[PDB]
Design a protein around this ligand. Structure first.
Ligand code: SF4
Lengths: 50, 50, 49, 98, 172
DNA sequence: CTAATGCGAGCACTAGTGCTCGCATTAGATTTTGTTT
């Protein structure tokens, strides 16, 4: 038939996975920041400040 | 394995291949099996999880 | 009326709209019966995998 | 994947850098060249590794000297052309000596 | 070529109607709405809508898609307003523009051929939209291009908009 | 994804004219973590 669309469990898992991933990235950041003894630098990049 | 399965020519195998590959080649199914297997290897009983 | 405030409220309301339309397209462009049918239909393929 | 470009800039400013990297090895020119030598030793009838070795500092053939080798035999493999140049060239030529 | 030799090859001098790309593939439709068979066939049909460049005329457009009465075309990147005039989304240009382009092309060929016979073999990779010719090139180990080396650098090409490009071609 | 573009429709205001609403399509965007000796 040449058609494709997400089933309910796929969407479900995608939602689940997104929040699991974000949760971990958060923890990753925590590990990073807690490595420092005396000094901490946070560097990032964006298109526009304002 | 893939060659053997193509040789058998079982309808189910073609049914799977048709769905998880492109119109030109079957490399995506290759990567799929690799990925599913690798993931299953993080369970204490991989085949049961599968 | 503060111009910025007008626009800010407009933005938020449109935010609500977007959230709902995302919800609708995610789950409710197909009846639950149809979802279950497509799912069940996929069962043999999974067994081969 | 950001680490190399960071190291290059920090090294460019006298700041010593260390990093356990797991990629980028085969795009280093020396590696491509040394590998090319190994390939040519395995099978000289590979035009691109042969040309790589010839143009590398290992031999130091320039673009003119390269096309000059090609002129001896256009249709054949590049190795064949090289052999032919040797077969016809006089020992007084610098290219011959290379 | 086709235009320059039309009179001799066909019988009459012709006008550039356009250049079109056809994507040969067996597409897969990703739809969020349940589709009837006819609607699916329509979506598949849509997947083959041809990109490229056209002549900005309602007649040319209608000659390329005789079905199109009003709205967007499913065969070419053109559309007609309720007015019946060309949609501004349409990938088209005027007569002068097409001729402008073709002239630029022949200029490119002349200059290139000149430099080839001039013996120009310099290592000058371009870089445009993060894309380089090196990725697809077999000769990376022959050139031994080393950006870290002085005298080895990419050619930065600005990915300008069509209007800007044609502007350049006119001024040149 | 998301942001912009345009085109057309309607709903509301004080029949035309404003502007919200909706749809549909390009355009640009993005560049993995560990396990042995
Ligand atoms: S790889 Fe060497 S030759 Fe091929 S394009 Fe990049 S630079 Fe020019």
């Amino acid at each position: 038939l040449r058609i494709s669309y997400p089933t309910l469990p796929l969407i479900a898992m995608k939602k689940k996975m997104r929040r699991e991933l974000l949760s971990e990235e958060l923890r990753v950041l925590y590990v990073a920041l807690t490595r420092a003894k005396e000094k901490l630098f946070l560097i990032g990049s964006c298109k526009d400040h304002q | 394995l893939f060659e053997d399965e193509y040789a058998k020519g079982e309808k189910a195998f073609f049914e799977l291949v048709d769905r998880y590959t492109t119109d030109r080649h079957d490399l995506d199914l290759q990567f799929l099996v690799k990925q599913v297997y690798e993931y299953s290897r993080s369970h204490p009983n991989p085949e049961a999880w599968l | 009326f503060d111009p910025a405030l007008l626009d800010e409220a407009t933005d938020l309301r449109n935010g609500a709209k977007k959230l709902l339309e995302k919800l609708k397209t995610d789950y409710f462009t197909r009846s639950p019966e149809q979802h279950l049918k497509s799912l069940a239909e996929m069962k043999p393929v999974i067994e081969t995998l | 994947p950001w680490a190399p470009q960071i190291m290059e800039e920090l090294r460019a400013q006298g700041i010593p850098v260390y990093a356990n990297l797991t990629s980028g090895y085969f795009e280093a020119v020396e590696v491509a060249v040394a590998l090319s030598v190994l390939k040519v030793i395995d099978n000289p009838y590979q035009d691109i590794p042969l040309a790589s070795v010839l143009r590398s500092p290992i031999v130091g053939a320039d673009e003119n000297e390269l096309s000059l080798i090609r002129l001896e035999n256009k249709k054949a493999p590049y190795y064949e052309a090289m052999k032919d140049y040797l077969a016809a060239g006089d020992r007084s030529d610098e290219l011959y000596q290379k | 070529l086709s235009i320059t030799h039309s009179a001799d090859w066909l019988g009459m001098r012709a006008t550039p109607a356009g250049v079109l790309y056809f994507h040969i593939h067996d597409p897969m439709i990703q739809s969020n709405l349940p589709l009837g068979l006819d609607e699916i066939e329509q979506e598949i049909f849509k997947k083959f809508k041809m990109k490229g460049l056209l002549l900005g005329d309602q007649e040319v457009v209608r000659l390329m898609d005789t079905t199109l009465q009003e709205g967007r075309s499913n065969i070419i990147n053109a559309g007609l307003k309720k007015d019946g005039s060309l949609r501004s989304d349409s990938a088209a240009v005027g007569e002068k523009e097409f001729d402008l382009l073709t002239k630029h092309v022949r200029r490119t060929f002349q200059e290139a051929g000149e430099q080839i016979t001039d013996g120009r073999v310099s290592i000058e990779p371009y870089k445009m939209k993060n894309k380089t010719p090196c990725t697809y090139c077999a000769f990376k180990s022959v050139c031994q291009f080393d950006e870290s080396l002085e005298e080895n650098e990419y050619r930065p090409l600005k990915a300008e908009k069509d209007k800007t490009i044609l502007e350049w071609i006119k001024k040149e």
